[PDB]
From a paper:
Here, the development of the Fast Fragment and Compound Screening (FFCS) platform, an integrated next-generation pipeline for crystal soaking, handling and data collection which allows crystallography-based screening of protein crystals against hundreds of fragments and compounds, at the Swiss Light Source is reported. One of the first academic collaboration FFCS projects was performed on protein crystals of two homologous bacterial enzymes. These systems functioned as challenging ‘real-life’ test cases for our pipeline. The two crystal systems relied on different precipitants, PEG and high salt, and both crystal systems had to be adapted by a distinct post-crystallization treatment to cope with the addition of large amounts of DMSO in the soaking procedure (Stegmann, Sharpe et al., in preparation).
For both projects, the 500 most diverse fragments (selected based on the structure descriptor FragFP) and 50 project-specific fragments were selected from one of the FFCS pipeline fragment libraries (Maybridge Library Ro3, Thermo Fisher). Once the soaking conditions had successfully been optimized, for each of the studied crystal systems two to three days of intermittent laboratory work were sufficient to perform soaking and crystal harvesting (∼250 crystals per day). The X-ray diffraction data sets were collected on beamlines PXI X06SA and PXIII X06DA either manually or with the SDU software. Data sets processed with adp (with the in-house XDS-based gopy pipeline) were fed into dimmer workers which calculate F o − F c difference density maps and generate fragment coordinates. The entire fitting and evaluation method will be described and exemplified in detail elsewhere (Stegmann, Vering, Steuber & Fritz, in preparation). The hit rates for the two example projects were very similar, at 6.2% and 6.4%, respectively, and showed well defined, tightly bound fragments.
Author numbering: 128 to 406
The structure:
Amino acid sequence: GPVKKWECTVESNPNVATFIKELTLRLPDGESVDFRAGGYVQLECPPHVVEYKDFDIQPEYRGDWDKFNMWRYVSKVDETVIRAYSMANYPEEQGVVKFNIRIASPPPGSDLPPGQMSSWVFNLKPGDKVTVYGPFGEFFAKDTEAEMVFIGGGAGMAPMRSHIFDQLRRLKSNRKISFWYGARSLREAFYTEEYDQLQAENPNFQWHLALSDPQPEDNWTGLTGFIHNVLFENYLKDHPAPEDCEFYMCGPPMMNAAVIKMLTDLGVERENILLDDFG
Ligand SMILES: Cc1cc2nc3c(=O)[nH]c(=O)nc-3n(C[C@H](O)[C@H](O)[C@H](O)COP(=O)(O)OP(=O)(O)OC[C@H]3O[C@@H](n4cnc5c(N)ncnc54)[C@H](O)[C@@H]3O)c2cc1C
Ligand SMILES: N#Cc1ccc(Cn2cnc3ccccc32)cc1
Ligand SMILES: [Mg+2]
C-alpha cells in the first residue's frame, strides 16, 4: 500500500565504531514497520544547524575525532531533507527501527558542506523526535537452497545483520551461510557478540572478521588484509563451485568494486552477485 509515516522517538544513538552510530528509534506505541530484510526507510530532518562539537561520541573514539579536526564542522541545512537508511533490525524485532549510520563529513581539507542528514543524525539524543517514512526495499534474499555468502563493510553492516538474522532466526534456514566483514581494526568492529552467538547456535553459519589495519592494542592474530583478498585466499580459492553460491554485498564503494572484480575473475556471474549500493 501507500507510504506510511511514523513520528518516532530516539531511544539510543551510541557510536558502534569511530564514525558509525547505531540509531535506535521507538515507533509510536502499538505500531510496527512491515518490512523485508534488506529493506529500508526514509528519515527526514527539518531545517536546522548542527555543530559537531555538540555530538555525543563515546570516549574510545574521540582521539580520531580530534585527529581529523571533526569538532570544527558546522552543518547548516535550509530545507527538509529525506535520506534512505537500511534496517539493521530484522522483521521480527518489532517496535523499533535500528540503523547503522556513517557520518559523511566533508572530504578532509576540503571546504565542502558536511553531509546534511548524517550530521543531523549524529546530534540526535534520546527523546528527540524523528519522522520516518516507508517501508521500501529491493535488496532481498533469493528463495533457493543455494549457499549464501554475505560480504559487508562499514555501515553496510545494517542490511547484513537484517539478512542474517532473518535467515537464521525467522526462516530457520538450513542453507550454508557465511558472513565476511571487513573493518580497519577491532575498535571498528561491532555486533561481534551477536554473530558469535549465531555461530554457536547454527552449525550452518560461520562468520569472519578481517582487519585491514589492526592496531597495536588489538594484538590481532585473526584474518588480516582487505576483505576481497581474505575471502578469496581463505575460502573461495579452494571452493569446488563458487559460481553456485549467492553473494550479497554491502560496503563502501572501493570495497564493493574490489569484491566484484575478485568474484567475476573467479568466474562468478554478475547475476549471482547482489549489491546494496548506498551511493
Ligand atoms: C537504499 C539506500 C540505503 C542506504 N542505507 C544506508 C545505511 O544503512 N547507512 C548509511 O550510513 N547510509 C545509507 N545510505 C546512504 C544515505 O542515504 C546517505 O546518502 C548518506 O547518509 C549521506 O547523506 P548525507 O545527507 O549525510 O550527505 P550529503 O549531504 O548527501 O553529502 C554526502 C557527502 O558529499 C559531500 N559533499 C557535499 N557537497 C559536495 C560537493 N559539492 N562535491 C562533493 N562532495 C560533496 C559531503 O560532505 C558528504 O561527505 C543508503 C542509501 C540508499 C539509497
Ligand atoms: N566503511 C568502511 C570501510 C572502509 C575500509 C575498510 C577496509 N577494507 C577492507 N576490505 C577492503 C576492500 C577495499 C577497500 C577497503 C577495504 C573497511 C570498511
Ligand atoms: Mg538537541
